[PDB]
């Protein structure tokens with residue numbers, strides 16, 4: 001079915017520009033619309049969409065309505081201009097999901113066998129690659145609950161297209177690209193420890209909270225399982241590198257050797273040729 | 287009577303369907319419609335752009351369905367903003383995006399409907415990322431040849447847009463037409479996330495993910511050694527000697543600075559041992 | 565295509581493969597390259613019909 005989704009900045013903006021539409025008139029809830037997907041393969045892609053007036057009451061927390069006269073005839077519009085573009089699901093800006101979201105997908109399953117919902121974010125904050133994606137399946141449960149319909153997270157990734165980077169990538173103009181090979185990889189390293197070890201502390205504090213409160217989630221078992229896959233090397237005191245010690249510097253063996261060999265001859269190219277051309281102009285002029 | 291140079295405020299949402307709907311018609315030319323509000327004579331804004339059915343038999347003035355707009359405006363009422371129509375646009379991917387013979391026939395028809403009806407063209411081909419490309423024009427009336435034929439006041443917004451002058455046939459259409467200025471009213475809220483969504487997705491996906499060892503340096507040493515002798519024969523070729531050969535010639539680049547950065551790639555990637563671990 | 569170019573398109577769409585063995589003369593629209601109907605008959609100009617003769621003014625009794 002649906003494994004991963006591809007969200008373009010163009011269709012994501014179609015949720016963002018509608019945040020100006022109903023944001024000025026208010027009032028409650030969020031921006032919600034129906035998603036037009038482009039499915040060429042198991043990997044899902046999204047090009048365009050259409051935003052529909054939508055509201056969700058608080059009291060009355062289970063009340064939701066799409067406008068389906070907007071959904072029907074406007075489909076024949078986008079279908080007439082683009083035959084490949086069709087509705088794969090819906091979307092909204094979240095930020096989180098209330099329990100009522102179970103009924104939005106099951107209603108529109110007449111349009112698509114499986115409707116994928118995309119939670120987006122109009123204001124970028126944290127922690128990383130934004131928005132979100134969910135898929136609607138039924139896993140029931142191990143405890144014996146009646147059949148449980150819970151949306152499972154779908155990994156979301158941004159993607160590009162020809163001719164769409166004209167105006168999009170133009171307006172920024174302030175970015176330095178990249179530079180690959182010097183700063184590009186090292187800034188990630190400073191962040192790879194930051195973003196790597198912050199979720200380490202956020203989860204290890206919530207995993208300690210388990211014993212305290214919030215149990216379940218037990219989880220189970222996914223938590224410790226892949227944590228023990230992380231445990232191929234801990235790495236703890238001290239590094240257990242006795243076999244990887246001589247191999248540590250042995251990987252730095254040729255990297256330092258070439259860096260010593262290149263800088264020697266690069267100098268011979270830089271130093272000699274500079275002295276030659278310099279004294280040819282300098283002393284022959286005066 | 288009084289005519290002042292117009293300034294076009296385009297929304298980042300209206301910029302989407304210009305290139306996107308134009309990409310769907312590639313290679314063939316499409317016909318769209320511009321949506322916006324007329325503030326005054328010297329400024330104009332396009333707040334929305336929508337897609338219209340592409341013509342596989344060629345663009346015509348009847349390609350725009352009036353019941354398509356009448357059903358669209360009604361759907362814009364239940365949508366947040368029901369703004370009145372303004373003008374039209376069309377893609378021209380196959381060439382340098384100039385107004386064709388059909389574009390002038392649909393001018394007097396659209397300029398009768400709406401006052402301005404700015405003619406807007408767009409092309410995918412001229413660039414990819416860092417150029418505005420697109421196009422825009424506005425019909426100056428040929429009946430005005432009796433009157434003064436050189437609008438507009440506040441000139442160089444035209445005059446500067448009259449640069450580069452874009453070859454000949456394009457500005458050959460400057461007879462009976464005059465282009466219009468396109469500036470971006472700030473969407474920067476969306477434009478700030480446009481940079482954040484683009485670069486974060488391009489930074490190692492987590493920034494973590496991405497962060498032929500000696501052999502890649504054995505393949506590099508062929509570029510770091512076997513390339514040296516073909517590079518270091520040139521200073522012996524600079525020795526004539528002396529001097530019958532035409533000079534100067536500079537062979538210093540680009541291999542020297544490439545092997546420099548080649549070590550910059552290999553040194554900081556080897557620092558991943560010291561960086562990631564401890 | 566008789567222009568000396570050769571193209572690649574899915575099976576028509578409309579008239580199916582029931583007719584016929586590989587032909588010519590069929591109509592197709594501009595660069596869209598879709599064939600609506602398989603059109604007869606053969607070719608060309610005076611090669612198809614050399615001369616059109618109704619009947620002579622004389623009969624076999626004239627000898």
Ligand SMILES: [Zn+2]
Pocket residue numbers: 315345376386388389
């Ligand atoms: Zn045209």
